[PDB]
Design a protein around this ligand. Structure first.
Ligand SMILES: [Cl-]
Ligand SMILES: [Cl-]
Ligand SMILES: [Cl-]
Ligand SMILES: [Cl-]
Ligand SMILES: [Cs+]
Ligand SMILES: [Cs+]
Ligand SMILES: [Cs+]
Ligand SMILES: [Cs+]
Ligand SMILES: [Cs+]
Ligand SMILES: [Cs+]
Ligand SMILES: [Cs+]
Ligand SMILES: [Cs+]
Ligand SMILES: [Cs+]
Ligand SMILES: [Cs+]
Ligand code: NA
Ligand code: NA
Lengths: 395, 395
């Protein structure tokens, strides 16, 4: 019992995970998890440890404490659970927007890794760890398991799929497996995996590519469904737009981690309302026959439901100039004015609209669940402009 | 290897299930599963075997072949998988209405048991077995595990909850556990469990009372959700109406197995259209101020969407007398006439309506996903009448 190691002591009584076994222990008065690896594993351990010294500074990469006689031991930050146990054993009704936050943090950690020229290559819910609560009861997600990590030489876009063990079935990008694919895998491999993890969290446990038995088979086939994402819920429309890109079969169509972080999927209601306002300001003096406006109005009739005037509450329809009820731009101009004159807005109107800014913006997104997604895609034409830097990653 | 027993031979190489272990083997030139039980289990085995001799004749009760030296052995019908493995490891996109059929068969077997005065007391997806395909590639579900079965004396409504081990957490009716409940458990205990199994299959793996960790806790609380059942899909509305009854906290409000079998949840589209027609015929000469008609029209405005004339395709709206667009009864009268004069119906109309009878009935249920459920509830006033015996269990 209570085996003691140089600078790390752990009792085999507490077993945490299991070919290797992990135990709860202690290092230098710190509660930490401990890793023991076989001789054949002893080589993968030196790879992992190397990279943790290199990339652990980031809050969303698991902290590495030390390695210290027949086998090899690895101490790391002690966690409350994996992302898998989190999704399986927790009522989201009580957790609020915390799941989204865990996806955001996880994305931050991946973008830290990619910026270091490190492809993870094996991201999955079992790999993502949930931290013990800090002094303020806050928790975070962290990336772990760098055994299959590869570090690309500077100026290298990809890596050989052969000579490197692929992740375990279900979360592997098609470029890793298919004999047919000529192009070599790149960083987007992790975006595909992450795309699957995004869906696994939002759906509380489903997968784009079906049940665990046929996932990898479906991945190569390109047969995926996002059944859990409703086509007329604003939150679901946004999530589908991002996840569809992340899990795309063409790796070149998948967003980079830094794109993912800029995506409306992570925007507060406040920021959503700000985007709507910056767009409306941006296009206020733009010509109707112009490119920016043309693009915003294509397929817009569907977006506003043919006549958005006929789909708002009577209090606001009464308080409404030249507004054309089929124009997305006019729907935005109205919002920009109702937001600018909210105080001067009568009480029944303000009561029906709701409080600024959260209830206000949600008054419209609830009514027009494609308006934000439509607008975000259309306004990419201005991604380069300084005004829209908070909403797009340009570089 | 290949241990041989008197009339049963099995090889411990093939292990099927595991405190007891089951193996694939053979009895009298028959492929069968084999059960070995501990001495403490040796008592529960005599109970189970007794009841299988008694109730195995039913196709949806697992067939029992024989029992034949230090321990006890039990041979039974060999199955392809449990209901749990079925839901977890199978793409329903290829299986069609087979899952519903498996629920129907399972219900048939339970009603066989109840008619014998046998309460199962431990129904769960792991207990329900899927048969090997027969000569025609057809399969069936079957009840097993009678270890916790109780057989009620004649004329007995209930049984003591104490002195009998409850099922394992997650599927147990609240009457089995709560110290507060005065009324003793009855057959409806199995209906609650079945209600949970119904949802577990339709949702491809969710549970009314939340994730496995808090299910039993939520069961006692009465905190259940059927999030997977859409409020405007006809199929989902029907399923919710039945499942809500089966999992009711008040055992007296749960339907008997024979009620469940009569429920529209198991009706073919053909039979649905027949019910609509029998209802329309039944109420054709019923007074508007009458009880049957009054009941059918309460909350009916919502059911037909204020004006069903405004929610049907232009081909049929053109071909439409005195029909009042807010009356459920008039919506039914129209259907009864369009079905009676389908041949004499013009081609564009018949093209928009679809083929009799499946596409026809689905033309309306798709448009009015509460019409069948509303009508089924309202017309219970005629459950006793001979005409509606195919739709209600009266006895
Ligand atoms: Cl780059
Ligand atoms: Cl918190
Ligand atoms: Cl009875
Ligand atoms: Cl078949
Ligand atoms: Cs860290
Ligand atoms: Cs890079
Ligand atoms: Cs799920
Ligand atoms: Cs949500
Ligand atoms: Cs800001
Ligand atoms: Cs049988
Ligand atoms: Cs009975
Ligand atoms: Cs599910
Ligand atoms: Cs369905
Ligand atoms: Cs019939
Ligand atoms: Na641009
Ligand atoms: Na009656």
């Amino acid at each position: 019992s209570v085996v003691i190691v140089g600078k790390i002591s752990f009792c085999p009584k507490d077993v945490l995970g299991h070919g290797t076994i992990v135990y709860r222990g202690m290092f230098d008065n710190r509660d930490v998890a401990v890793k023991r690896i076989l001789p054949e594993c002893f080589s993968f351990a030196d790879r992992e440890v190397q990279l943790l010294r290199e990339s652990d500074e980031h809050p969303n990469v698991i902290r590495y404490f030390c390695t210290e006689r027949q086998f090899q031991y690895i101490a790391i930050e002690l966690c409350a659970a994996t992302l898998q146990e989190y999704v399986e054993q927790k009522d989201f009704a009580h957790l609020g927007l915390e799941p989204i936050t865990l996806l955001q943090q996880t994305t931050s950690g991946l973008a830290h890794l990619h910026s270091l020229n490190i492809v993870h290559r094996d991201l999955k819910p079992h790999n993502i760890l949930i931290s013990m609560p800090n002094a303020h009861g806050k928790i975070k997600a962290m990336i772990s398991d760098f055994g299959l990590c590869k570090k690309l030489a500077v100026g290298r876009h990809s890596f050989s799929r052969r000579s490197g063990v692929p992740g375990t079935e279900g979360w592997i990008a098609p470029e890793m497996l298919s004999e047919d694919c000529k192009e070599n895998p790149t960083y987007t491999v992790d975006i595909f995996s992450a795309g699957c993890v995004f869906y696994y969290v939002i759906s509380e446990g489903s997968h784009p590519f079906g049940k665990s038995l046929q996932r990898q088979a479906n991945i190569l086939l390109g047969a995926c469904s996002l059944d859990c994402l409703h086509p007329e819920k604003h939150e679901d429309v946004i999530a589908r737009e991002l996840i569809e890109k992340m899990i795309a079969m063409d790796p070149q169509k998948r967003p980079s981690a830094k794109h993912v972080l800029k995506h409306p999927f992570f925007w507060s209601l406040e920021k959503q309302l700000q985007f709507f306002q910056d767009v409306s300001d941006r296009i206020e003096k733009e010509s109707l026959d112009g490119p920016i406006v043309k693009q915003l109005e294509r397929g817009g009739r569907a977006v506003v439901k043919m006549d958005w005037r006929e789909n708002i509450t009577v209090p606001l329809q009464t308080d409404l100039r030249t507004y054309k009820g089929g124009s997305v731009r006019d729907l935005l101009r109205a919002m920009r004015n109702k937001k600018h004159h909210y105080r001067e807005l009568p009480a029944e109107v303000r009561e029906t609209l709701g409080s600024l800014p959260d209830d206000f913006v949600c008054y419209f997104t609830s009514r027009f669940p494609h308006l934000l997604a439509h607008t975000y895609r259309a306004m990419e034409l201005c991604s380069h402009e300084r005004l829209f830097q908070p909403y797009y990653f340009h570089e």
